[model samples]
Target: TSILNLRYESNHLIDLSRYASKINIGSKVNFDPIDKNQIQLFNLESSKIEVILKNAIVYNSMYENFSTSFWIRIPKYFNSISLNNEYTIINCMENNSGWKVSLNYGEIIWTLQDTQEIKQRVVFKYSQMINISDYINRWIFVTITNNRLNNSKIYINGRLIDQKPISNLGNIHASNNIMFKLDGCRDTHRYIWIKYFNLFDKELNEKEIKDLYDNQSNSGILKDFWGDYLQYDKPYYMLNLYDPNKYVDVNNVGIRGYMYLKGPRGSVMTTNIYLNSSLYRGTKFIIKKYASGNKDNIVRNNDRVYINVVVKNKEYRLATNASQAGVEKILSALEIPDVGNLSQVVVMKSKNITNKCKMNLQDNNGNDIGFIGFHQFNNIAKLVASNWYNRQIERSSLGCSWEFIPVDDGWGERPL
Candidate 1:
């Protein structure tokens, strides 16, 4: 199945399932890694297995020129590369020649190889990217990106290192449709510890790159539904799903809604809700989600409700990260009014919406604060059958249909 989120693979630092340091999964590990000290028998027996991340991307011409970055922490001391062969930290091959980011003795090497012609390789060496002479230990964000835009560029810790052209450094189209491979292609002594890694099929602008560097440990980049970068204002309303008390409309707007908690999963509770502005003390329109083809019944105290009504045709929206918890592990806690504005919150006019309703964003004084969601999922909308929570109680599970993709239909006993 095609993974929907391109950022998911890279941001999953804790999934543990996303990594593979094994030396033999598929290609070009020119040597068996188990020779400690190159001496632990140093032969391929006292194994210190080299780690490699699986090729998260499959065969696709869409990635002709992609961008990638990693937060790496290297060692404070190391032997001279003059004493040993070059260390290949990462290699992406395009028919025996693509690009290689490596280390040699004290210098960091970047090579772009062209195999179509006479098979020549261009070398761009810089010491500023890393210095064995004066090494420091901490998380270092490293980014290497290129497109036809401006050749290839390198940045370490959000700072750019001038890239000077060198001889034999072949003209563009350096890779031969190479599949990405991290932690070396044909050698060892490659790689330190990398906590986060991101690879984008499109080049990221300077500002986006800076944001990536700034949000070091953050999981995903903020982008609109179509993957374009998003610029949003600070949220005027925030909901913490883990706690029902925190789920109220903070603007003091008398809001009305329920959050059927069948668990804290994205499936059961959705803040991407709507309501009929009138009768809002108990709005018929509510924000909730379920499966593509399932019934919605609130058996048990499974559904948590909220109150934040709106006047008819008067809708406001406050966008939160509409990404589903099932897509990635949900966070432990969320402090309200979080300051990372990476994407936009959507607002859609209600008229031709075919009878969809909405509400809320009132402060304690009963003034309109703001509504919520930027068409969450770029298409977030909601409402469930009235008396949904009045269904027959259950001993265990709540009989609710739900999947986190984007709630397609509603549930309940009465009308929408």
Candidate 2:
């Protein structure tokens, strides 16, 4: 049987079920690209913004073991003050018989139903108070395990916090359709945002649950539906430079962007991400002769010049040692210098570029220089995928229907 693995990456929802089927999105649901730390923002501001799965509840009568896992974040301003503020997160049912996972007054409730003689009977039920205030705006990993012989379990952030024995396990019933209502309750409000969702055909042990939580908690990077590494080929955006300091902060826009540093020391840069050969060659700087004493004098022949660069968490540096000495010697050590620009525009030789990179330049006695301009490059697949996704979602009245390739064809793959 194919596992149901759903992931949101590069502004699209991908299903890695490999069953030749796809998830159905609710009308009025949409996604927006967020900053670096988060994958994307879910917009469920409409009346119908739920995701649906078909034929997922297999072996409903066979006493099958199943589990569901996902990440969610609740808003602090949730309407818990109301008496009947039940926010439904997931519901698996047909007619009157099924199971539901919902939140009411900061308590997470798991309810089960069974059909008996034309009437729905409560087979199992349990609730756990999670204190939504502590996890406001923060991602919370949740897992629910339904066992055939044992009691059902609820885990928060990978820890088993509660469980409920089945009142009538043999009579538990469910349909093939499952509804993931991200908009919370119908008339209440959107109390939570989902990051990703997973449904397993077997119960996950404590070790498995703990490992899953650890892996997801440490990684801010978006993963594939099946947990494979993403390809890095998307072009980086040019970072907007601030005046004077030539400072470009990735904290605001998150990363996956580049900046250029041009100066008489001769010109250091972090540009053209995903363009590896270009990055290596772009980081090089050509040595140039400069007079001593003034601001534009660049650097003296004996003065030290250091270029410190950071790509993600790694660091690289290039500087002229005292042994290089004279201008001609420095020029030979690096490459031929340009005399027309009065100073020089250096070449980085051969280095690759990524989405997140930073560079610092120190001339002579440690003076800071800023970026002059930006380099332009196009990520063709990103543009195409974005356009196609927009068209498809728009055609469905802002909801979505999955097709082959575009959403799963690896076009949206990029380094996290």
Candidate 3:
């Protein structure tokens, strides 16, 4: 099969009457002009044929078997289209073995034919041709657009035959004079039919044409051909660690914290807590201490401790109210700091947690403070407090319980 490839920079509708003669065998002429672009014609004949666009040409001639049709390139501007502006002409002479053109106004399009309109247009002349019978009706399609730069393209039988260049046409504003005509003086074997067509103010590109043809061919329907034919990107999200609403409830408490005896004399029972969620990068926790069961005299710190303080994917256990076996196993499996000293305080780091878990204090001997409960911590006060001078000190050492002062560099003061 022959292919027609053309592109331009301006806007101009195709003047079908200027290139080929129109025959009327119940055939139709349809041209839904978009914006402002000229029409183009493709003459698939070996003999010289005359085509008239205006009404000044004479209608007297005896021509042989041949087929002709005109295609228009709609600009990428005008948004209004009408079906009452298209038609076709036919010359009644000879055995009427001429051409036929179909106008599908519902889809704002037209088609060419020869011999019979039996779902396929038979060519008058034949050569060493490849049997493209399966491709017919399977790859035939039309596209319209108002985008002049990369406007309309047409395909026939799964093959891209023509492309309308937007640059070759003039500026097609909102509204303009757009019409279709059938020009023929002497010929009888020419007629056309129009099934379903549509009109748009936008221009269709090559890719859009191919996509529409494939979809419409599969469904055997001619719906909206030149709609918004583009794809867009989807949005992404990051998981929230602390918010319970952001996580899925597995319905099983798979992990828990444990309290264990540590320090030189085993005077301190360091409790380690384990959250169900993995202490992966960006994992953080809070620590709030209370004097025995006195909720009123509780000291709270928000996000005072972070896991895997020095490496990525490292696991650590917080002092909870459970046995130490589970907590120790988890920490040992991940090679993280497992035990704490006599008076060492573990607080979540305030530094920006990027990819690695960063701790506020390491395994250093200073203030050996134990773990605390999350709910017992006064989050609002600590977040709004100006300084940590008096509020950060262990409340148990405030002359209430055992008077154990924090040594500057003692075992309890380290971050072990």
Candidate 4:
């Protein structure tokens, strides 16, 4: 039968948008915070729930012919061996004579049935360990088709594994109340995320399966902190880590990323890798400020690049010349010992308008302290105070936080 004839995507777990399936859920199971609505289990070995066919109508309808697809990120990062014998996904009857999709002995295994089998089953596997290590900290697509005839298949993002027809000797019983579970069985404790579940009464062909896998992946629209789509622009996120199909705004203002690698490197060598660029560099502007030197002249400047030494509660601004790099270079010349309050070491920026500045803030030790929206901290730019000190800036411990403040000297005064 064609998939469109009996496509049973799960939506009973939550709203149709969250895409949660119909499950009564055990006490230990809950929704994923970051991914949203995905059934999250605290531990695998200890947190097992037999079957939560909360909406029997949805589940029972798929007794003989059913297709299941969902996103899963196993909890084992940096531990490929963890996939050694894990059951992140499973569906079967007692005595292991039912349907199951699992990672057993360093391979992806699937259990399927066809015709009327006695005590029999069909299963197969894939031995790609590092493929998972790369997929760690990210979501992956998996599809399972439970059909006995021509329309039967098992697929992962990289490739589709075929399933054989069930052929057991004993009685193959089919019941409505079967044991289907996720990250909640015996053996060992496991961590994983499951989202976007789909259930179809009929099996899906190769094109249909592949299309579904590609569409639901991490890549879609870049989202901002507000959770709104950037539309023409890219979603902006602070620097650090990025996964494939995920995009982030890092390092510079107006910068955007199309995730490619599941990686942790400066370059997009690709882990869940990424591809990045920009359409706008923004209009250029230039200015100068009171400049810092020796001891007394330090705080006297316009707070060149957001260093703080609150005099009466005002963030002391240093001075900067033309080059943006020169603005950051001030940290190397800063005397952190002279600045006491932590707000000084911290830099401030407006969360809105990244088309402004994009550069890393440095510490007195010549190390990257953090990142800020812009490098033009001269009084002419919009900013308040927070972060850093001189002498102290040149060397020693360096840490910082965001203190978003704005000065209304640009283009004209901003409305109050």
Q: After superposition, how far is residue 162 of candidate 4 from its true place, in Å?
A: 3.7
Measured against the true structure, the TM-scores of the candidates, in listed sequence, are 0.34, 0.46, 0.21, 0.43
- The CA lDDT at 328 in model 1 is 16
Evaluate all candidate structures by whole-model CA lDDT and list the values in order: 0.32, 0.40, 0.24, 0.36
TM-score of 4: 0.43
- Can you tell me which runs of candidate 2 are displaced by over 4 Å? 9-11, 35-59, 78-81, 117-133, 182-189, 218-416
| Model 1 poorest ten-residue lDDT run | 403-412
Stretches of model 3 off by over 4 angstroms after superposition:
1-139, 144-146, 150-152, 157-159, 164-168, 172-181, 205-211, 218-416
Ranking by TM-score: 2, 4, 1, 3
Model 3 per-residue lDDT tens digits across residues 111-144: 2222232111212111112211112111123342
Position 16, candidate 1: lDDT: 33
lDDT of 3 at 123: 20
lDDT for predicted candidate 2 compared with the true structure? 0.40
Q: Alpha-carbon error at 326 in model 3, in Å?
A: 66
Query: Which tens-of-lDDT digit does each residue in 1-416 have in candidate 1?
Result: 11111222332212233433223213222321321111110112232222333455432331255566765444322323333456555556555545666654434556655444523322333332321111222345677765533366677767676453333334333332222233322233333433344556665678888887766532232221111111222111222222322112222222122222221212221122211111111111223221223343221111221322222323332222323232211111112233143112122212121111222222333332233221112231222221121222112111112111111111111322
Pitting candidate 2 against candidate 3, the one with the higher lDDT is 2
